[PDB]
Design a protein around this ligand. Structure first.
Ligand SMILES: Nc1ncnc2c1ncn2[C@@H]1O[C@H](COP(=O)(O)OP(=O)(O)O)[C@@H](O)[C@H]1O
Ligand code: NA
Length: 564
DNA sequence: TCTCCATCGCGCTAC
DNA sequence: GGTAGCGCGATGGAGA
């Protein structure tokens, strides 16, 4: 039940003090919804880190993608080195890798019950279904030295919380027994296992151990062993659960036969039986999450348990890039219901599998205690519910928001080519946005023809190779990058002095108030930052973006002359 | 009611 | 009875 200790070589600067203080004040006044309107490049992760430290609550931060999530996580481990900073997302291949991520998920949920100083960076996997956090906590095996317990009953418990007996391939989520030593590999650890040495019905010693080399690392007075699955139930309840699944199965197979669908019924039966055979062995299976209703014995159509429930009631939520993350959350349920419904109709799953689902937005709302939305361009939900906004526009470095010229489309490419050439001579980079992948590739060709070092960047390119291209631009291998909608949230490249927005009047999600400001922001990390919008008209979106950027530059200039 | 891009999750379908 | 690699719905925001 510890305390956050913020570790930074610097202290709040710019308008971070007023931002940190207004947020902390609102949290202490019990304000449910708050918005931090923080321009790109102002120290937002540091700002938030200060708020978290001053209210000292377990906090959940939700990001809309994992590149950002991973960045936030690495940064928050830096700022809070002696605190529990965790990561709760699911599988991806840009940071085995699959087991590393399952390990962190268990490390996240266990940390919530062990200590108070916890920060969990998460994707929308945070609103997907888990098993009861009550069952998970009460099934924890709490081991103390000189404790009256039978080696007998310890092993009974471990199996029921999903550790596999395995004397040979001793990996995480397993345990092995040699004579009087039961050795355990917690699901939250990748390197350290637990040695538990018995003498009759008494534990004589407990040792933290490097599982690979056997190097004893030290002693332990006590140790808590959490379950190796988030969908754990008591063996007591499995007997009735398997009955209720069997009953659900026959009813469903009758539905299928009464509509023909013999191929679907055979498919369903084969699969359910296999899962049932496994449930009478241990308790788990391949797709165990789909039997959550029956396993937890809960009323049908119940609200699922999520990561939010594993948090204490007085927790804080930070929504990063809220203008994008909130719409992501909102549409998850209907999409899920639809994909699951096709599986039930084709005999891949029982209808009870619909209860294994993500929260609705309404359900999510009710699980919120206190929340802070963080966006340079917050959406209508955030503004509607928050009492005004906490504006953070003075960057700590004093870097200004860029200037924005509007130029005609006629002769635009040749204008841009000329403009790029100037930047090459000043050892500066350029970013261009177009409307499609095709146009991006076509333009990249045309620039290569004109003696410009150029490469494209869009969703067809895999994440690993994107890192390379972003590095190459920085190193000066490329001078220009042409994209569509990846020159956005979280692309921090200070070598870029020019952003060129082609088809700036082609209104829609690619050219809205929100996306324009976000794109403009890529030129705010440079002291000569400049933006050019090629267009024959100034759309309502362009108007607002130019207007807001002009206000920020003027205000920032006003600050810089005052403070040297 | 479709398009443009880019993201998440899940889970079938081939290695 | 092991897993990476696709395909799927929803979302922003307008045009058509
Ligand atoms: N209060 C501060 N004093 C000095 N430097 C800071 C402060 N806050 C942030 N920084 C640094 O300034 C740089 C730019 O800020 P950054 O945190 O990237 O802004 P954002 O994350 O909002 O885009 C970062 O490398 C960060 O380490
Ligand atoms: Na909209």
């Amino acid at each position: 039940e510890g305390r956050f200790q913020l570790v930074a070589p610097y202290e709040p600067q710019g308008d971070q003090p007023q931002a940190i203080a207004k947020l902390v004040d609102g949290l202490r006044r019990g304000v449910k919804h708050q918005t931090l309107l923080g321009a790109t490049g102002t120290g937002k992760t540091f700002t938030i880190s200060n708020v978290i430290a001053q209210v000292n609550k377990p906090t959940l931060v939700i990001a809309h993608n994992k590149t950002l999530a991973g960045q936030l996580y690495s940064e928050l481990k830096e700022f809070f080195p002696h605190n529990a900073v965790e990561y709760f997302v699911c599988y991806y291949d840009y940071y085995k890798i699959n087991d590393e991520i399952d390990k962190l998920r268990h490390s996240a949920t266990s940390a919530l019950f062990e200590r108070r100083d916890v920060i969990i960076v998460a994707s929308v996997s945070s609103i997907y279904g888990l098993g009861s956090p009550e069952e998970y906590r009460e099934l924890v095996v709490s081991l103390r030295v000189g404790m009256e317990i039978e080696r007998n009953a310890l092993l009974r418990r471990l199996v029921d919380i999903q550790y596999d007996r395995n004397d040979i391939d001793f990996r995480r989520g397993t345990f092995r027994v040699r004579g009087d030593v039961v050795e355990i590999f917690p699901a939250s650890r990748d390197e350290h296992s637990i040695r538990v040495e018995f003498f009759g019905d008494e534990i004589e010693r407990i040792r933290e151990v490097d599982a690979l080399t056997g190097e004893v690392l030290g002693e332990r007075e006590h140790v808590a062993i959490f379950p190796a699955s988030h969908f754990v139930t008591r063996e007591e309840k499995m007997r009735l659960a398997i009955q209720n699944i069997e009953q659900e199965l026959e009813e469903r197979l009758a539905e299928l036969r009464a509509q023909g669908k013999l191929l679907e019924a055979q498919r369903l039966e084969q699969r359910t039986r296999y899962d049932l055979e496994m449930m009478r062995e241990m308790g788990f299976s391949s797709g165990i999450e789909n039997y959550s209703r029956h396993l937890a014995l809960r009323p049908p159509g119940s609200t699922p348990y999520t990561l939010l429930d594993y948090f204490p009631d007085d927790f804080l939520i930070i929504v990063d890039e809220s203008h994008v993350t909130l719409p992501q959350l909102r549409g998850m349920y209907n999409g899920d219901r639809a994909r699951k419904q096709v599986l039930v109709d084709h005999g891949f799953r029982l209808p009870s599998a619909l209860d294994n689902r993500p929260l609705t937005f309404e359900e999510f709302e009710q699980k919120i205690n206190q929340i802070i939305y963080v966006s340079a361009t917050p959406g209508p939900y955030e503004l509607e519910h928050s009492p005004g906004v906490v504006e953070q526009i003075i960057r700590p470095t004093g870097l200004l928001d860029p200037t924005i010229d509007v130029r005609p489309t006629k002769g635009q490419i040749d204008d841009l080519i000329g403009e790029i050439r100037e930047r090459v001579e000043r050892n500066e980079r350029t970013l261009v946005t177009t409307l499609t992948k095709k146009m991006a590739e076509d333009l990249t060709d045309y620039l290569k023809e004109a003696g410009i070092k150029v490469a494209y960047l869009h969703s067809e390119i895999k994440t690993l190779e994107r890192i390379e291209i972003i590095r190459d631009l920085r190193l000066g291998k490329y001078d220009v990058l042409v994209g569509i909608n990846l020159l956005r949230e979280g692309l921090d490249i200070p070598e870029v002095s020019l952003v060129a927005i082609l088809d700036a009047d082609k209104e829609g999600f690619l050219r809205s108030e929100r996306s324009l400001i976000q794109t403009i922001g890529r030129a705010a990390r440079n002291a000569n930052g400049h933006v050019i919008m090629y267009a024959d008209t100034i759309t309502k979106s362009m108007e607002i973006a130019i207007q807001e950027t002009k206000r920020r530059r003027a205000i920032q200039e006003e600050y810089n002359r005052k403070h040297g």
